[PDB]
Structures are given as C-alpha cells and as structure tokens.
C-alpha cells in the first residue's frame, strides 16, 4: 500500500557510530531502488548481487538497512573480502554479499569546530568480527602479559578511540554517513 520508509534511515538527524551500528529491518512494504540510484546526491552506490534496476524488478523475504558513519577513506572497507580497522574490528559484511553500499560526505553535520568526538570506532580487538556482528563492549583491552585489574594505563587500553572530526580536515578523513541494504516475501519493486 505504501513506500518503504527510507526517509527514516537516510534523511535521519543523527547517525550511529560504527562500533555500534544501527540496523532497521524492513517489511510489508516495497519501494523504488531508483530514486536512490537516480538520486545523484550520494558519492558511492555499489551493489554486489545484481544491478539497482532489476532489484526493483524483484521481491525479497526481508531487507535490512544498517547505517553508521566512518572516515571517507575507510568506505573502501565496507565491501566483501576487505580487511582494515573497520572491516575487522567494527563492521564486517560476508564474502557472499548480496546488497548495496551507499555513502555520502557528512562534513557539514558530523564535523564540528574544535573536533566532534561523538563518533567512536573500536581500535583494539584480539580477533576480527564474524559477518554482521555488533560488539559494544568497553572492557579494558590487555595488551601485555600482566593483567590490568580494571585500570586504564600502560598496555591497558580502553578499546574505543574517537574520530576527531573537524570541518578543516582533508576529505579522506572527513564524516561519511553509510547505509548498507542487505537482501534475503514482504517488500519488492
């Protein structure tokens, strides 16, 4: 009877940090994947199943749209088969991915003068994440041989570091909001 509400995830006031990505399941709807593709207000739009046209020529069981914000310079890791500090420790899409990655600069909103530290990213983990995992722990990372007894200090590092977005940064280090739609009926096009 009505549009899938992308206006809820893409045009939303605040975006979640990558370590703690937000995910919206979408159902009992169907929307055009060709206002997004023909938007032209997005710097990235790459699909891994089939092309953005036939997609709205098909119906799926359920569609999910995860959303977070990273450095533009790391968007190349939101894809199957990649490795980095974001695809291993914060967010990892499977090598059998079917869906589309979409991303645009957010430097007007997510960056601040004097730095915006609301955006965190995990920087230490003892092994990478399995596909679509979400780790929100904050336990002190022990990087030595001696335990930390719960005190941040040498070799005892609190695991989340903050993107220090400032508006005067370089574009490869400026805020990119990202939305990843994955596909597995209730919605179609």
């Amino acid at each position, epitope marked *: 009877t009505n549009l899938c509400p992308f206006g809820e995830v893409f045009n939303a006031t605040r975006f979640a940090s990558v370590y703690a990505w937000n995910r919206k399941r979408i159902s009992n709807c169907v929307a055009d994947y060709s206002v997004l593709y023909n938007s032209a207000s997005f710097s990235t739009f790459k699909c891994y199943g089939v092309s953005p046209t036939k997609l709205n020529d098909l119906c799926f069981t359920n569609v999910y749209a995860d959303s977070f914000v990273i450095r533009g310079d790391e968007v190349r890791q939101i894809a199957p088969g990649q490795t980095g500090k974001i695809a291993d420790y914060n967010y990892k899409l499977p090598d059998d991915f079917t869906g589309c990655v979409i991303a645009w600069n957010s430097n007007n909103l997510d960056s601040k003068v004097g730095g915006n530290y609301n955006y965190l990213y995990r920087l230490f983990r003892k092994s990478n994440l399995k596909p679509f995992e979400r780790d929100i722990s904050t336990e002190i990372y022990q990087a030595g041989s001696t335990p930390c007894n719960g005190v941040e200090g040498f*070799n005892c590092y609190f695991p989340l*570091q903050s993107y220090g977005f400032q508006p005067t940064n370089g574009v490869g280090y400026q805020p990119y909001r990202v939305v990843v739609l994955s596909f597995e009926a209730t919605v179609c096009g």
Partner: antibody
Amino acid sequence: EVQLVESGGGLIQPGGSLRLSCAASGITVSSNYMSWVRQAPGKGLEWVSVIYSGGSTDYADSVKGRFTISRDKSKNTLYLQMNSLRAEDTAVYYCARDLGEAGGMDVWGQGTTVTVSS
Amino acid sequence: IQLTQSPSSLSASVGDRVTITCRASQGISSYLAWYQQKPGKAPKLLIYAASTLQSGVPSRFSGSGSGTDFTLTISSLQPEDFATYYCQQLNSYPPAFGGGTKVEIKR
C-alpha cells in the same frame, strides 16, 4: 621489563632473501599492531609493514610482493621475511609496537642493519 | 598526505627556548606524534595526539597544534637534546613521517 630485541640482519647479495626476528618481552606480539620501520643511511623514517592483532597485514608499495610479515605467538617473536632484495633495501630496520593514536610507536627495537651488496 | 617540518637544521645555546614546526598538507586534526632520534639509537616517542606528553619524557618538551600547524617546543634546551626529531601522522595507514630536523647545541 618491556623490550623488543631484533636480530637477523647482515650482508646479503641482491635478488637474495633474509629474515629478521624481533623477540618482545612484556608486550604480547599477537595482541598489538606491530610494524617494521626502516631507515636508510642519512635519510628519514619509512614505514615498511604492519600486522594487526586480528591478523590483517599491510605493506608499503615499495615492498609489496617481495616481503612478508608474520609472528610466532609461542615465542612471542615477530619476524619479517625479506625476498628479492634490492640496493634500495639497505637500511637499519626497527620493529616497534604501533599503538595507533593512543600514543605512537612507543616501544622500539635496537635496530638490526641489513646491507644488500654484491 | 606529506608532512614538511622546518627548519631543516637549527642550532641554539643551552637554556634557550627552541620551536620546530610540522606542516601537514591536508588537515589531520590532532593526529601527530613527535619522536627524537639520537644518532645510532632508535627513536623515542616524545608526544602523541599533538599535545599529550609520553610517560617518562621530561616536561621541558611540549606540543601544540591542530589542523595543519603543529609545534614542538623545548622550553629550556639541555646539552643532550641534540638529535633528529621527526613528526609522524597517526591515522593514515602508510604512516607519513616528516623529513627530519637536526637540533645542534651552541656553545
């Protein structure tokens, strides 16, 4: 207490191969980002390679395909294999624990010179 | 990104206040670390996150800066401070480092 101690460098004919070791103590090699930094005679500091806790590895373009980095967790050493060596690879090679932006490379090795000559 | 520190060589008497700068080409927020390399020995992390001093380093060394202009100050030069100092970019994986700056001590 905490000290990286490298070895393995010396004279090695070009096209040749060599493997340096960098045994740590106090720091677990498999649990930090450990990188190899090298310094050519009279020049600046050039990062060669890095190996995240997680297992991923990254290398500078000047070294991709010729050198591989790894670690024996049961000896806590971190090694770096040198293969198909050039005259451009002559340098002191330091291995240190890169702590990202939570501090910099704060622990460094003593350095072990590699000289690629005929 | 490339960092370009200057002055390439510098020389000042003991007790003087010395300042070296690093200019980054793109804008790196507060991701810079300054190391000091005595001849023959490996470097020592002197400061991270532009202004945070590393545990053990004496307090007569201090960083300020953000964006593209970073400054390393030695507030009162002592005789053993002659070395080479290099800025480094934390946050860009191929770690860009600066070219180096040789402080010599006058007398």
